[PDB]
Amino acid sequence: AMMNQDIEKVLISEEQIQEKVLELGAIIAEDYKNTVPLAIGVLKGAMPFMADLLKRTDTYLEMDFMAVSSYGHSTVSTGEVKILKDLDTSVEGRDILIVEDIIDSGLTLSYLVDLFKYRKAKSVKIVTLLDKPTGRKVDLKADYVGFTVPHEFVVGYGLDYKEQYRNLPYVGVLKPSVYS
């Protein structure tokens, strides 16, 4: 029927997300006021948050995107992933802001962060809509965080279950029958 028919509970409402994005955007705009950073999202989950975040960030910036895929074993050990789409511009000397939907193990993100430092970024910071710090497999701290969630079992606003639900305007938890 309707997608709400699959949602057990709304954890973060659209109104709550909108207020947070407004707040974070104002903070990021002030922190990068005299340097046009490169704001980068990792496909696909970061897309909705990145779009609304940046639209509330009143400062000059450039957008870009990466796509990556798992190598399997090395990905779940060091976070190394295969670059499917690299950035359209060089990193050297740039201030990089990685926009993410959620950080859990933090392995792939940590790999990307240190890749950008290898590429001589002037700086690298991270903004994430959701953080689950109890999931860390590496010490990786986001610089800007929307909400801290006790678990990563949620859908909406970029987050998927079998590639669906990313288009929900809120963050929720699925009913058990959907996945089991």
Next chain:
Amino acid sequence: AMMNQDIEKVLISEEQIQEKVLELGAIIAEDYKNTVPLAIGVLKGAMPFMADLLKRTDTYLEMDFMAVSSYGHSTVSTGEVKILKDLDTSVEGRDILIVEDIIDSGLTLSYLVDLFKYRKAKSVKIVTLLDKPTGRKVDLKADYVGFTVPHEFVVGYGLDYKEQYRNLPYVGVLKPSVYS
């Protein structure tokens, strides 16, 4: 020292874009009620509109993205472009909805539509925020359109000038001094 100071005039306000996105999403949700389409955005310019449109599209769908680059002359004459990032899933038998920020010549978008048909898509439809039909170099009509514009000399809500301004939450016209 800030962006709005580079804008001569707002052509479509943020409020007009939100109302339009709301309307378009309700139409698209109805049209695709039965089957879960694959909604595709071509990076980078389609991202903000795609995020906000799909958030307002209350139906089951899958999101995906493509990245392409110019080959030079064939791109300008046939629309043929290099695929830098192909879809994550196969096209055969799927209903495809391409989400675009603006259609002008329509050459590349047409190359992509007919590629998806070569790949045996069940159907291919297009939703664009902006359309400039006077600019066409191929017969390509969008199925869903936000606003009809004159000229592609506009920035904001995905549209850039030298990679900047895409993060404005409205569509505007730059002051002549910005681009000389």
Next chain:
Amino acid sequence: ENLYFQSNAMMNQDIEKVLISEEQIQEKVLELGAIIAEDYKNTVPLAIGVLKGAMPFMADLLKRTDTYLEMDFMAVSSYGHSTVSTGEVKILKDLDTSVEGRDILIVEDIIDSGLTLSYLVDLFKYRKAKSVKIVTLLDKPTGRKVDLKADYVGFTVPHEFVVGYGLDYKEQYRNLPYVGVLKPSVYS
């Protein structure tokens, strides 16, 4: 984590027999190069190899093709369902130049089901190639899952578990200078 034991093992010990020797491959490559050079007298084709298996053959063939031409490469990967039925694959690396108006020569190590290659040929036709032809070192036409005849063929094979000269078994043996059949013990 990973420990490797090769001891004094040599690849030839894994080979039951040499099916197509280096000498045989080189004589056929020389003939094919002369025929292609004559056929493409009037054009400069875009010769494309699909990574990884086509590489050794493509290098030797083109070195024996005395005519102007350009080289390019593609990389693709399976979608897991439409790949087995339609040949549709994900493009991981597209060509570095446009196909429009070019005479395309696809260089392959082996054609078996032919599904992916059939997909690529008609993609290049959609992209307005002036012509598309295929040269394959080996052909296993009994494996076909679609109607696809290569324009130039080195050898007909039927065998299972063939390796060498770009053909692999679990990513090994591509660097052999001949085409061999593996001992059954190697793959049990």
Next chain:
Amino acid sequence: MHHHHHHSGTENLYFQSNAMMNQDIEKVLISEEQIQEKVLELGAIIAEDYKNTVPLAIGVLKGAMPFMADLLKRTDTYLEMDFMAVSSYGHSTVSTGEVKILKDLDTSVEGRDILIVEDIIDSGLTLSYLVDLFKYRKAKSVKIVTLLDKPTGRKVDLKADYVGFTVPHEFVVGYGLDYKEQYRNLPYVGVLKPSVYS
């Protein structure tokens, strides 16, 4: 006559019907027979050096393909092949080596012995970027084999572990090396006539 265009950002190429490559070459610098003898030697050295491990031998497209094919077929040891493709980010690639990855390795680098196979090294900037990318990815070791070397042309410190031939002041094409995408398919390394390139 015949013509075509290629990228880039476009060039138009016009050929007379009886134009032949060889006549574009002033002299053969390194003959096919010299190359065969060198690959045989290097292949044997490489097989001995990598007797204890299954290396990942990686070619950077497009130029490295012919040498890589011939060298590896003379390298009688267990190994895996892979390929990368890269693009320039413009003037910044020219000064730092940083390039856009268009095709990454099909397998992970962590813990692997990587052997990069190149056609020529001159400034060394891009290769150096790739070597240290693999070290960032925790390669067990990274070594380089190049057919041709111009070591006084370096803009970064990078010594190739294995080198076929050192090239002097000559504009070379063939055996993977191009001029405007032509000549890669010559079975030798030739000195291109000044008239061809100005």
